[PDB]
């Protein structure tokens, strides 16, 4: 079975470089055209480029022709993307795929791709790594028709993604909802993690939300206590 | 030129035939032959559809495809649950040496029950008031379909900026969550009686509201 397997993805600021690796397995790498295909997020599909069988030529999408070169080394079984000068319009998620057909594309042919990786991301932003503050969003006094109380916590202002939020050192499970991240018009990321517990606890027991952000190295946890009302 | 154009949603109910459509040029789909991809966003596509109209081995007997001119077609004959995503198609463009995606379609397998939104609602934190910010978070869970429309209202009264609302995105629930954040000085906060989210989904308005008194 054919696998592709990438690697290499990180964040980055504008300018800056990266290398992609796609390691194979399950066929004779030497014998097809390679593809990178890329997805940024929200949007389609869009075509990178194509490196022959024997890698005498190299096609581009105009919007990276000059700063990305792809190679291949067929006594590795491996391709390569080196990605220079890149742009925050060049975030997603990066595929190699291979192409099915006779080692090349033409006016003859082109069979596309056959089989695919599982995706490297990239992410080019002139944000700077920047950890979390952590706001508790206290259960309100304020009843609610049902055996419900919500509290929080916000996690707010942060790059990159991803955060871990656990509760009560993740001995605390039943009834957590974390949302997805707001991307702000900052380029900062803020999330909201609630658990939803009966009301009757609420002052009976004692829930901390453990927030780490590994990128920053930013570990905090917050007590999240009933207002003094 | 780069761009396949295809549709950008196809509907249906179960059982019913959909078909897609992906309209190229002379240069490309006219030119070389046309695949079909299926891919849930984010993941790894999977190859449908090669060469107009094979199927690869796996692939369901109600996937056909078809070709002619410079416009190429998907057809899904007998609309399953399992077929709600997106499908893109692609071809070689012979004049700019490219190899093309289509701009991609979404499906949705129609009915499913609408499901009412859960709203709830936390006021600025004491300690965010202290760092002289001020952020009332208003969050959306459990509705089908996805599409809600947020509004924040301070006293009688539309609040004007400072709304950041996430799209709403997919559980594993195969209901929707969406964020709403309203970003204030703790002035303005305190400067009101009242704060409200209110969340509009299918012809229903849900509202919540908050208010400075802790403890007043």
């Known amino acids: 079975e054919v696998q592709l397997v990438q690697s290499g993805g990180g964040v980055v600021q504008p300018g800056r470089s990266l290398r992609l690796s796609c390691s194979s397995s399950g066929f004779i790498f030497s014998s097809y055209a390679m593809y990178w295909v890329r997805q940024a997020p929200g949007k389609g599909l869009e075509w990178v480029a194509i490196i022959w069988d024997d890698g005498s030529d190299q096609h581009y999408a105009d919007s990276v022709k000059g700063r990305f070169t792809i190679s291949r080394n067929d006594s590795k079984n491996t391709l390569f993307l080196q990605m220079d000068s890149l742009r925050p319009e060049d975030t997603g998620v990066y595929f190699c795929?291979?192409?099915?057909?006779?080692?090349?594309?033409?006016?003859?042919?082109?069979?596309?791709?056959?089989?695919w990786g599982q995706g490297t991301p990239v992410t080019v932003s002139s944000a700077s790594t920047k950890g979390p503050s952590v706001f508790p969003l206290a259960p309100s006094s304020k009843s609610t028709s049902g055996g419900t109380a919500a509290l929080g916590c916000l996690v707010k202002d942060y790059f990159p993604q991803p955060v871990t939020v656990s509760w009560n050192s993740g001995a605390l499970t039943s009834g957590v909802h974390t949302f997805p991240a707001v991307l702000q018009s900052s380029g900062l990321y803020s999330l909201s993690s609630v658990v939803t517990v009966p009301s009757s606890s609420l002052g009976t027991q004692t829930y901390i939300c453990n927030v780490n952000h590994k990128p920053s190295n930013t570990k905090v946890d917050k007590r999240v206590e009933p207002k003094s009302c | 030129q780069s761009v396949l154009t295809q549709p950008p949603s196809a509907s249906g109910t179960p059982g019913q035939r959909v078909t897609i459509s992906c309209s190229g040029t002379?240069?490309?789909?006219?030119?070389?032959?046309v695949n079909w991809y299926q891919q849930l966003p984010g993941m790894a596509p999977k190859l449908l559809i090669y060469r107009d109209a094979m199927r690869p081995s796996g692939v369901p007997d109600r996937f056909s495809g078809s070709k002619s001119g410079a416009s190429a077609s998907l057809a899904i004959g007998g609309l399953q649950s399992e077929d709600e995503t997106d499908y893109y198609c692609?071809?070689?463009?012979?004049?700019?040496?490219?190899?093309?995606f289509g701009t991609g379609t979404k499906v949705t397998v129609l009915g499913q029950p609408k499901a009412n939104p859960t709203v709830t609602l936390f006021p600025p934190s004491s300690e965010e008031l202290q760092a002289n910010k001020a952020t009332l978070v208003c969050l959306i869970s459990d509705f089908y379909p996805g599409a809600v429309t947020v509004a924040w209202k301070a006293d009688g009264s539309p609040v004007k900026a400072g709304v950041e609302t996430t799209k709403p995105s997919k559980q594993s629930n195969n209901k929707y969550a969406a964020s709403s954040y309203l970003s204030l000085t703790p002035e303005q906060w305190k400067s009101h009686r009242s704060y409200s989210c209110q969340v509009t989904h299918e012809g229903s308005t849900v509202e919540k509201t908050v208010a400075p008194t802790e403890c007043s």
């Open positions: 692609a071809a070689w463009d012979v004049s700019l040496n490219a190899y093309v």
């Open positions: 795929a291979r192409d099915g057909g006779h080692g090349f594309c033409s006016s003859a042919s082109c069979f596309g791709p056959d089989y």
């Open positions: 002379s240069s490309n789909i006219g030119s070389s032959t």
